[PDB]
Design a protein around this ligand. Structure first.
Ligand SMILES: *P(=O)(O)OC[C@H]1O[C@@H](n2cnc3c(N)ncnc32)[C@H](O)[C@@H]1O
Length: 641
DNA sequence: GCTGATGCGTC
DNA sequence: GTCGGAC
DNA sequence: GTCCGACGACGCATCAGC
């Protein structure tokens, strides 16, 4: 009755009798917040899915128009990714709004949020000074979702103040745990332990057990009750795969949910199908730590090795009639930023090609020296809408897959055929569009040599893909069907540095109550100063991270040492007496606009930082004076050539 | 009209 | 992007 | 193996402050 007592984790949950609102009423936001509470309290994904499914079943049975907003709230998304809605709110705006809503000084709010590792706990445990004696009406799920979208659409001068007004308005109306999850959503850290795959599982379960479109009151609130547990499990798995394969081809809830409510899940693939112009989920890669692990994973299946190019994924759609769209790995519209690519499409496809979807890597290309350029150069291209004459950094497309051709979806076709269609129907032009360099072999010596060659040829390593056995493009069956093999995955291979710990950052979320990250430095011999080089936040086990907290607590300083230079780096929450030296691995070294390490040795204005740094081990046997020097950092950077 | 801080989207 | 935790 | 969320560097786009 009262949503404060809503229990979507209840045994024998009844979508009508155990809901906390009446038929046709708007889903209360507190119903969603209580569902989030029950999800965050458990560690078993399957239990989270069951709890979310219970909420969704009540939404279907009682208030179907609120299904879409509740789903977006559970994902902390604003809409389909290709539409590009973004809150434009981060911790800065959010903390100011919290401080204003609660009438507290910003620095008190900021300090509390850092100590607690969560803005939600700060917003929830303080009253709002704007509340009247009688509170405003309870928040609804659709109302909150619409206010999030209101925030996202505010743009231009003075828009921040307007966003804050909306946020404060939400907090004034919050009850019980609502402010916790409003704040977490706005900060982008809902951190339920449940995300896209679990939401899809909950959704297919919900609409299977409680079909949409029933005359009220629904005659069928639990369509699994007549089945054995075994038969029910098989049925829910099959229905889950129908939703998942459709979603992977059309990852757009605005399209799927109306179809689901009107026609049901079994008819879904007849209404939502892969098509050029609608972005799809890309195939991802599993990191593989050696050629021996490749063979263990693929066993006897024939596979191909391809250079792993160091650029940005570009999913290129050519629609029947000639329109071209380009999407990112995360279904964002990138059409506007590749006018050069769009103008070259007639040049890459044979005239018999009427439509396609290509999987490519966009790589920065130096036309004067005719060679690949680093990722850093690629990222200096403009974004959003770009006219063709603005292009300064040229791009070469390295094509490696073909997902659709002349009206045929290739999702269920083996790579051997997809690749043959790619190779035969498209045209290579050096420095503009070329097929990924590849090798079909099972010889370990050739693969190892090919990996070495890929690095010499300006690539990150190898992608490995089966050709015929489990070699389709069905993301719903396995999203990480390809293997990525990089030299820095191998123990003893790659650049490891010994770096000095000079600061620590309080942890957030799963790291709340300990350190979440650390500031590291190299030793500049010429100035006898430690220079910040990067932050570090992955590579340690939970046990190692607790050990770090124990070993570093005695090194906390109230002020920095005068021989430690960090320039523009984020000031650590705790300064540390330089003493601990850690072994750190990276994929590459980058020219940094922030970090002072080795500034002046390779570039006059820019120091050097680490790409993909991770903790390996503590160097008990090293003092800071024996850490990697800034001169050694510069030498490492130069030999990347 | 310019700049620094911040958000967001790439890896 | 890398990584470790929970299942 | 899957799923998830801790955390990394970087640069364009945006907007408050000037
Ligand atoms: P991530 O580091 O997980 O690796 C996957 C991405 O690598 C890029 N890529 C470059 N070259 C290839 C080939 N030949 N095949 C597949 N993927 C490649 C893509 O942008 C992936 O997203």
């Amino acid at each position: 009755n009262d949503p404060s007592g809503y229990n979507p984790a209840k045994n024998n949950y009844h979508p009508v009798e155990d809901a906390c609102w009446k038929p046709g009423q708007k889903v209360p936001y507190l119903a969603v917040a209580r569902t989030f509470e029950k999800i965050e309290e458990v560690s078993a994904r399957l239990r989270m899915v069951e709890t979310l499914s219970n909420l969704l079943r009540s939404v279907v049975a009682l208030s179907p128009p609120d299904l879409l907003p509740v789903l977006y709230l559970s994902l902390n998304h604003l809409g389909p990714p290709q539409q590009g809605l973004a809150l434009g709110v981060g911790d800065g705006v959010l903390l100011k709004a919290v401080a204003q809503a609660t009438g507290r000084q910003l620095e008190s709010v900021r300090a509390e949020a850092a100590e607690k590792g969560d803005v939600g706990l700060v917003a929830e445990n303080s009253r709002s000074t704007q509340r009247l004696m009688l509170p405003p009406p309870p928040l609804t799920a659709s109302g909150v979702f619409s206010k999030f979208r209101d925030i996202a659409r505010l743009t231009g001068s003075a828009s921040t103040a307007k966003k804050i007004d909306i946020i404060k308005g939400l907090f004034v109306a919050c009850r019980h745990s609502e402010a916790r999850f409003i704040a977490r959503s706005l900060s982008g850290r809902l951190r339920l332990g449940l995300a896209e795959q679990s939401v899809l599982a909950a959704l297919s379960q919900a609409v299977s057990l409680t079909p949409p479109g029933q005359e009220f009151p629904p005659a069928m609130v639990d369509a699994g009750k007549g089945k054995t547990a075994e038969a029910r499990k098989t049925w829910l798995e099959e229905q889950g795969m129908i939703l998942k394969q459709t979603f992977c081809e059309v990852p757009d809830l605005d399209r799927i949910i109306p179809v689901l409510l009107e026609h049901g899940l079994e008819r879904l693939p007849e209404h939502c199908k892969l098509s050029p112009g609608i972005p799809l989920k890309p195939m991802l890669a599993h990191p593989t730590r050696g050629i021996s692990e490749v063979l263990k994973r693929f066993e006897e299946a024939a596979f191909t090795c391809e250079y792993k190019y160091d650029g940005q994924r570009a999913q290129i759609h050519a629609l029947e009639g000639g329109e071209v769209k380009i999407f990112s790995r995360n279904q964002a519209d990138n059409t506007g930023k590749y006018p050069d690519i769009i103008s070259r499409i007639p040049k890459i496809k044979l005239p018999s090609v009427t439509s396609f979807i290509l999987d490519t890597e966009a790589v920065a290309w130096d036309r004067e020296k005719k060679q690949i350029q680093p990722f850093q150069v690629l990222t200096t291209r403009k974004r959003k809408e770009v006219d063709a004459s603005e292009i300064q950094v040229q791009v070469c497309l390295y094509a490696f897959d073909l997902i659709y051709l002349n009206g045929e979806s290739l999702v269920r076709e083996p790579l051997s055929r997809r690749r043959q269609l790619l190779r035969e129907n498209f045209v290579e032009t050096e420095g503009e569009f070329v097929f990924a360099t590849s090798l079909d072999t099972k010889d370990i010596e050739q693969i190892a040599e090919f990996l070495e060659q890929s690095v010499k040829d300006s690539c990150e390593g190898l992608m490995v893909k089966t050709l015929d056995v489990d070699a389709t493009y069905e993301i719903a069956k396995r999203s990480h069907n390809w293997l990525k093999l990089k030299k820095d995955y191998l123990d003893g291979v790659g650049d490891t540095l010994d770096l000095v710990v000079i600061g620590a950052y309080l942890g957030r979320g799963k790291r709340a109550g300990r350190y979440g990250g650390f500031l590291l430095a190299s030793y500049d011999e010429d100035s006898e100063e430690l220079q910040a080089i990067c932050k570090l936040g992955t590579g340690f086990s939970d046990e190692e991270l607790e050990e770090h907290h124990q070993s570093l607590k005695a090194l906390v300083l109230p002020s920095p040492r005068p021989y430690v230079r960090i320039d523009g780096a984020v000031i650590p929450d705790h300064w540390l007496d330089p003493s601990a030296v850690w072994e750190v691995k990276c994929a590459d070294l980058s020219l940094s606009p922030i970090y002072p390490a080795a500034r002046g040795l390779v570039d006059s204005d820019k120091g050097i930082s680490l790409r993909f740094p991770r903790f390996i081990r503590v160097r008990e046997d090293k003092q800071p004076e024996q850490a990697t020097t800034s001169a050694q950092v510069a030498c490492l950077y130069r030999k990347q050539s």
